[PDB]
Homo-oligomer: A and B are copies of this chain.
Amino acid sequence: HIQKVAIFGGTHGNELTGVFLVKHWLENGAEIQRTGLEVKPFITNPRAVKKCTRYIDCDLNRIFDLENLGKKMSEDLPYEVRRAQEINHLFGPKDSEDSYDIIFDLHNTTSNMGCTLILEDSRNNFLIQMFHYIKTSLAPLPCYVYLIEHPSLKYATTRSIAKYPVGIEVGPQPQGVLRADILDQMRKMIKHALDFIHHFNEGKEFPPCAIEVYKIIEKVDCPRDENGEIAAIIHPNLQDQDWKPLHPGDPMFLTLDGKTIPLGGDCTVYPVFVNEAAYYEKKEAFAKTTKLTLNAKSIRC
């Protein structure tokens, strides 16, 4: 019932856990094969990987949409646009029924997020169930679900080609660096994800379940100069405390002088992607989330 599965690595070329795993699995997929399940590992941005850079012309993971995927194939096209098409053709088309069933996009963050799963749809019982299985399997190792469903802030990811897109994000890891513990953590996330798909194709019935997710609400920039240069930094107490609750009282930023700037607003939030290297460019110091619980109905077949 689920037949076509891919694992993407190297969507960003300087996030090496995915690149390294995939390169190995292309030479020996044993670890990712399951009986009755054919899984294809793939390097999405081979050129950014070669320059150990994040992208060449633009962020690949933001352009899998109509505006871009419908463009006439040319050679004056940004590399990543030319490439998003090549990928849509191989694992899609997006929104077609010939699309791959499931795509896992592998990712790293400099933030201290631990094992993270990214959910694009708050009503996909199938994914919710997958995520619950992985969570439960990993325990007591924590695992967190970032829900990026938003009327305007949902971006068009590489993995959104599939009917079931899955983001796998593990941190903290500096860009351009290959840590062993981070690699082990990612592997295990995948083992349990594939294990769940097998169990499902073997007709196992899953009761209802609830999981905690963190829902995007707003992205915060750091204080800036009169000239638009960085004017404070992530307060020591906020640094590395991804996922933990931050109340309106508490410290957010720190100047050199160094006055503390506190949260404000009227409600507790849960920060994610705190001090992510790649978001300095995007003017995002961190993202605010509300914690909530989602339910899945049972599923089978």
Using CB atoms and an 8 Å cutoff, list the residues of chain A in contact with chain B.
20-21, 23-24, 52, 110, 172-181, 183-184, 229-230, 233-236, 239, 254, 256, 275, 277-278, 280-281
Q: How far is the CB of A174 from chain B (nearest CB, A)?
A: 3
A233 with B175: in contact, given A24-B256, A52-B280, A280-B52 (CB under 8 Å)?
A: no
Instruction: Flag if A181 contacts B230 (CB, 8 Å).
Output: no
Instruction: Flag if A180 contacts B230 (CB, 8 Å).
Output: no
Q: Which residue of B lies closest to A253 (CB)?
A: B180
Q: How far is the CB of A89 from chain B (nearest CB, A)?
A: 28
A234 CA to B174 CA, complexed, in Å? 14
Q: How far is the CB of A202 from chain B (nearest CB, A)?
A: 28
Q: How far is the CB of A175 from chain B (nearest CB, A)?
A: 6
Greatest chain B CB density within 10 A among A20, A23, A176 is at: A176
Q: Which of B176, B180, B256 contacts A234 (CB 8 A)?
A: B180
Instruction: Flag if A180 contacts B239 (CB, 8 Å).
Output: yes
A138 CA to B177 CA, complexed, in Å? 30
Instruction: Flag if A277 contacts B174 (CB, 8 Å).
Output: yes
A234 CA to B277 CA, complexed, in Å? 23
A68 CA to B172 CA, complexed, in Å? 39
Q: Which residues of B contact A179 (CB under 8 A)?
A: 233-234, 239, 275
